[model samples]
Target: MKRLTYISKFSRPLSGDEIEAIGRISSQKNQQANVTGVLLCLDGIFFQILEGEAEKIDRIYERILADERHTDILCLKSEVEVQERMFPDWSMQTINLDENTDFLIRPIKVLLQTLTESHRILEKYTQPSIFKIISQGTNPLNIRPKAVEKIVFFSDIVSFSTFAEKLPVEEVVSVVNSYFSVCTAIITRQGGEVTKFIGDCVMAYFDGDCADQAIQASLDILMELEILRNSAPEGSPLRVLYSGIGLAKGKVIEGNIGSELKRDYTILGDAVNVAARLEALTRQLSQALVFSSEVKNSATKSWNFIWLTDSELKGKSESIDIYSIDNEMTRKSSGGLEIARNIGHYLERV
Candidate 1:
């Protein structure tokens, strides 16, 4: 029987910012306290294991609530015992794996039980898979950040305003949800996390082990919209909509940014900015998806797709080289890719 040592689980429903802030704070404290272990948050639940002084764990636990950052504290398993320390250097750091595959509640439970039973140490120098370390609880929205150097993905709906106007209120709501559901499912399945959703647009971030996965998700966003538009239920008034996608790769400050009153759980700096700009350039390029050279270079070895060269994007000092999904190829491969360019044409009517 597999043994899970030092098994435990904790929970709360926290906003993205709060989750990241806690991670940052806990990580810092972990360094100071010389405690080490993995901390995971998903679906509003938290699970952390400390492999150092029990006293320090107690101290950290006492102060954890003061942040007012989390609530609905429910302990699934208190500190049992472990033969070895998992993270001996850190005092504590929290992680959220909302879109992670290993964090599924069932496997986590079994793993936790195994670790508890074995009473063994984490395989030395072998970092527990980020996906494996996260304790499973509820369904959370989470994704791994860029692992292959760095990566970014951006998404936007076609002529959001026109779609809103031409359609009945119920139809508009239904259409939006339908589209959102499709995109969200694909992105998450690709191991990307939904970062932010603004009106008709959404952002997904992937880091560490899932960076390639995030790029794949971005490419999917570019191709999927048009494909779905074509196959939508027959007689279903079709708008032939498409989502413009942009992806980039670079160094980005990925974490929580906010005040005591509020926060944004997101990535910052150039990588994030360029991706947004590339998505905007989709209008100029007349393509459904675009990626900065940064993304293409890093992703070429891992995944396959096509696009064009330097295109001028808004609010930029110089032209940026961006590429869009090749329409000819996509149409042939993905049944949904064959979309009537007339879909986005409705925006003018708005």
Candidate 2:
């Protein structure tokens, strides 16, 4: 994972609701991407820190530049890899420095040092252009699109329609929320983000080309749901709820897709279809987790599976390989250890 921190000056002073709107939308998007950070505004100047996988941080920053609300963007720091996050708890914690004298006049370097003390080593010399922008704000209009590799995930509640049919409308809503609340928390912790909560299903993706994390998260989902099932109140509807998850990896177009009146940060590609079908196939196959051959090929450690017969997915022409996990398959202690070591080596190179 990596952290990116930058400061910008808004073109115009924004309303409280407008600022909150930005925070709200960003929080949802960030949570889905496994990104965390804080946004602070003071006297029309903005200081935001974003931490996530390196590719995800870059993709998100491109979108931030495209957002018309902010201008004079200055990237104070960029591409600093870290073992841990600086602001892990906040999806998007917003603060107003106008009323806080202690933070009002602090230098950008000081703020960077304070927030990312352990993650970065200070440089004695700073770039002239960056210093000028921080000292005397200047608007730079250099922005471009970025493409990133991601692992798509789709999960659905098994027999959702049949279950909903038996419950009252209010009870149905409560049950769905409880299911989603648990899933979202687990997904976020595993470094994946929930992009959409569709009915009783969830669509999420992990940016940074980390299919291993996605697969591990998929297994964790099934394991946690079992806990949810056993611990539910005696006669609660949740006792009968269960889930099926599918995962695939591929590149997709991700950005703001809509008009000036409405916009959404989402992905579009065939991988999404494959993942959705995988989720649906879980019920047909009687498996809790099913993944594509692509994910299986890229896995760093052995994952027990039953290779299902190849079949043509709904929207695709050719037949694709599929596999189902025996929910009892447990990760060896070395499974995640390998991933951690690989990441550590990669960070060492950077």
Candidate 3:
């Protein structure tokens, strides 16, 4: 069985294409070393498993360190003592990068380090993915499981239907497209997965080595939207998007969720519920951002709050204290909206 090692990082950005390329090249190297593993890159960092003899791993690591493609690598585990193999059939598999575990920085470094170590296999492998390693290079299960504490964030435009109705179909589509384009650029750039885009809403995750990374990413999303509005052209329909964000940290079911016809790769738990409630509160509280007390406590900066009378939320029994994110910067930028028609000029130029 393969020993999967979950990689962690708090710096840099990693692209899906880069990750797949790593998987392909690394797997080729692993084969010569008689190692087996698969790499999953979501956002930036990676989770993978390696199984093989110790001597062969050592041999390949030397090459890995020298390889320019990999950097900031950290050894998560070794397969010598693995409990199972994540990929038994293929030598290596790199899946679509989804899920946001806080802004993933240093994705390449993480991937390179693991590839090198998997190639090396010198020391008895540790289960960095799950703290396990095995003699054979095969991980039947995902060695890298969800972290114990994570924040599942849901960001959505309030009354998207109404907003779309306010404009012509062409204008509405342009506005929505522009909104999503900016969102994708910012979110993906930060190493957070878009997860799924439903209509005008998006669900992303932030599971960094620490929870702070997640909070910061969420804060940035709203702040960036505010910035986009400010920079929009005179006639562009793309304007400030008032979004509600919910965040909480705790053990949540990680991995596949949904039916065979359609599946959602997400987390399910109190943390998830709390996040949802927090987002819903945006409308009632008339706040740009609201977060659970749990998140506020971990926040590095002083959080701004507006007390909306406590009420029962669907996910929680007790009356919640919904605090609007009064990040001075965001509040200041939340000015009046305007149609972004001038953006057409930029589009035409491009």
Candidate 4:
């Protein structure tokens, strides 16, 4: 047997009725799987602990990751080869903490109030990396911000605002998830981590000057977008889903940023902003990939990257030159590193 504790948040708000429905459904499925767990959801934060066979827990976690409703899933802790079981009788007992009932909420409220110094406990739980914070029992006093070089990647779906305004709420969610799923898979495969999904835009970074890896990821992403757009049914949102990618390379401050109760392990610097501006500029230019000059210096010599324009980027003191890739030429010359290599299998699974 194994045990696991995790935290997750809903992508959309849920009412009391909806919460109950989820609990009821979860209980039914968990009962069949012989899994026992306790779930506490207060103000959209989901903290759950599951005790079950190791394989079963893995399967459940995979399903949770695939579900569109959940986001920011973090495993606070896990234990292996545990013989004991907590909440052995309850397949899945869910507590809706937003309700002011005495059995669950009032006591928790009192305990929370007593520990007022631990302000925004829920916010603390939502930090990008919780395992370290939680295991250390509290934040360390001596942690310092450090500088590192990296290639920042920023991308977003073109015409996303229009789609959000015109499409139904459920379809809008589907579109957002689809776009993010594609971006996440490609970015992670290229040794990059997606730090944030700010609305429609994705912020990611690659260690050091891995310009070739980042540019290849962008090409693969654009190719995937083209494939999906070509195959999507008429009148569907997927038909119009396209992305603009931007890359910039420079030094960034990588550290924990927040108040006493909450801090996120994320990066911030000029390169990040430059990457966003480059992606924004793609709307005016006629290309899918745009990058700052810093990245051009570190890129591959085989591919042709034409100079675009020297435009003043937002928040930058002076205008900087930008470049873009000709997808057709790169796709043609990348004989073995073909853009169309083995991607359809993944798309079909999607």
Candidate 5:
């Protein structure tokens, strides 16, 4: 695949109808040619990126150069053979700046400056690596932020604050690292991604049969924690290691979030907030695992889950039902083998 990025000055500011017309034609042609990209027009300046086969990109570039509506066209980066398309799913996405005046211009200026600096190097083509290009201000558009359904999982070591305050810093670090390493491996093995780790707290997410995966991971982490506890040296504070997990399923905003200096692919929504609250609830309820009623309903298979009381989580208006799984039988009959196989297939496609 090849990616070509360029900037040009428009003859004049485009009207809404003119923008729509351009987008309509561009989308049709690009889709037919198997080309994908994003177009941004702001204050008579157009920044565009075209990605497709080398031959098709060459043809597109020729046409773009000849278009009389644009002048002073400068190819920022051209004919760069990329391993994969940056905008593979987009068929010429058009961003009409006319609608969004709040978008900052500083990041855009930074990107343009970076492109110009790269052009001055002899190996300009090699300097703008795929990661660099993707991480640039273009990431905001590339992320294509939107609401999505996901299972959010949150966990934290119980009494971690006490351990932090009482134990030596090195000892606390060692114990925390050991516990997190085990939990992280189990989460990943069960088809979950650890999104953040704050102190002894760990936050993760899953998709597809997310509830199933989350349940399985929670069980496995507990089983592993037992081993960790038994292996702890006599009188070691690690022997007191205990963690609680909470899960919730709902809509969340998933995409790039941050400023010019930093960017992160993260999720934000009530689902995430609720999950955090549920995790905190575990400590209050004295349970190892707790999840929302929504997750219980989403489960494809039944487990020995005990229904907890209906209570209002913090910052919520209405009461919600909560449940917990504490029995060894539930862990044993979770059908982890099937879940693992299905998750493997899902991960392969993604």
Candidate 6:
């Protein structure tokens, strides 16, 4: 017995009915004899598995390859021996990615990743949205396009250049790993999803209803990061482990993005841009954390928020109010020092 695995992308945009029609015929055509497998579709991508007799699997795969709707059909493990069929009951199982179920999300990504890697995304994305997004396939939530109001939270390791440049390469990744682990715990626990990791910066999302929880979570994140900074040996790179955080509230478009071979789900729009701008400004503005007035006004549960000077962000036409948490820790500079030159200049060259 043998099983064959492959990945593919759509030749063009396809409607639900069109996709379903294709699936129904393929399921029926591959149903005869001993051939059994499954077809998983997301956005425009098709990943499939076929297992049975080698001859039967090959014949079925040839018919699949002949389909004009699927392009960039690259087969992985075109031929592999198997004692038993993975999908014995179903001739061709058609799984939908639009549901809230985690079965397809976890299993499909696991199989896709086994083809290569970046288990980083799968491991870090534990939020229910992850399940919903992955369950919906490669073009997650794109079928129904709408901007949802959300609190976009952005944070980054302060003086990452210091540790990232000065510290040993091994320890730098280890500490960064520890840092992300700590931040992910707080962000996810506070009803937020860690959206992306951009260099040293981390972007996340909170439902508009959880503004207070998100604010409180940022404080807790700062408190925990302080402990990590304090615990590092004196004069060590980690002693400068503080992080700067930024928060903004507004509408954001959430969906999948990337080329055919590589794809991922992410959020976009002004709120996302503002949150990242706020995070980067924490260094230039000399503050531990900064947030747009939008987040301050939307929270049902209030904390003491002190107004900071107003300024225009890079992309904005007018000025906006920025605030910091009233706590002493948040009022001061997140990291005492800054580097004028980019870290790339310090990299060892051959």
Per-model RMSD to reference: 15.7, 17.7, 13.7, 10.6, 16.8, 15.1
Candidates, ranked, TM-score:
6, 4, 5, 2, 1, 3
Tens digit of per-residue lDDT, candidate 4, span 1-350: 98888777778988888878878988998899989999877766777898899999989878878878778776767777889999999999988777867776688766744443243355554534444556444554356889999999999876666666666789989988999999989988998878888999899999876899998888889888878878988667686676778999899998878899866678999999899999887766667688988888897667678887647677886778899887673333222212123222323333
Task: Give the least accurate 10-residue stretch of model 6, judged by summed lDDT.
Answer: 341-350
In TM-score terms, candidate 4 sits at: 0.57
* Model 6: CA > 4 A from native: 1-128, 132-143, 233-236, 310-312, 332-350
lDDT of 2: 0.71
Measure candidate 4: CA RMSD.
10.6
> What lDDT does the true structure give each of the candidates?
0.59, 0.71, 0.58, 0.78, 0.75, 0.73
Residue lDDT tens for model 2, 1-350: 87777777678879877888899999999999999999987666778999999888889999999988888676666645488888989988887655455654667545644654432223222223334343333322221234666789998875566555566789878878888888888788888767777888899888746777888887877777767767877666666666778888777776646687854456777788888987776655545677888888877777676787745567765757887665453321223224334433433342
Model 6, span 1-350: residue lDDT tens: 87877777788887777777866886787777567888777655777888888888777878878888887665545445567677898777776453326875778655654543343234334344544434333335355545788899998876677666666889889878888888889998888888788877788989887889889889999899778877877555555556779899888887666688765566788888888888888777656778888888877776888898746678865667888788777655424344323333333320
**Residue-pair clashes, model 6:** 3
Q: Number of clashes in every candidate structure?
A: 29, 2, 49, 0, 0, 3
Global lDDT for candidate 3?
0.58
lDDT of 1 by residue, 84-170 (tens): 666555556565666456645658855655664343233322222222334333211244344234467788775666667666789
Which is the winner by lDDT between candidate 2 and candidate 5? 5
Pick the winner on lDDT between candidates 3 and 4: 4
Ranking according to lDDT, highest score first: 4, 5, 6, 2, 1, 3
Can you give the lDDT of residue 140 in candidate 2?
24
> Whole-model lDDT, candidate 5?
0.75
Residue pairs in collision within model 4: none
| lDDT digits (tens) for residues 183-258 of candidate 3 | 6666666566556666776666666333465566767877777778778777454543456677666677666556
C-alpha lDDT of residue 335 in model 2: 30
- List runs of model 5 lying over 4 Å from the truth: 1-141, 329-350
Regions of candidate 4 where Cα sits further than 4 Å from its true position: 1-143, 310-314, 329-350
Best by TM-score: 6
